[PDB]
């Protein structure tokens, strides 16, 4: 699994 | 396009 | 000191 | 250009 | 279990 | 005081 962080603001974070 | 910082260890930070 | 991005959601940093 | 995350609180990011 | 960024430099990435 | 990470690659994280 994963780490992201993303945004294109506020930064989500997510485990896949 | 959304900014993004990823790992599994090294952070991977780009733009898509 | 450490800096700190933490979230279980919101990205929350400290400096610890 | 530089990809920024940037915080005092929230994490801001932008690109520049 | 928390998402971490930690730094003292290298920016370190884990789960707990 | 402001936390930085940024990149233009490797995070950089500063304080300052
Ligand atoms: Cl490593
Ligand atoms: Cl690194
Ligand atoms: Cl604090
Ligand atoms: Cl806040
Ligand atoms: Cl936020
Ligand atoms: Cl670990």
Chains 1, 2, 3, 4, 5, 6 share one sequence.
Do not use: M, Q
């Amino acid at each position: 699994a994963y780490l992201l962080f993303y945004t294109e603001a506020k930064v989500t974070a997510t485990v896949k």
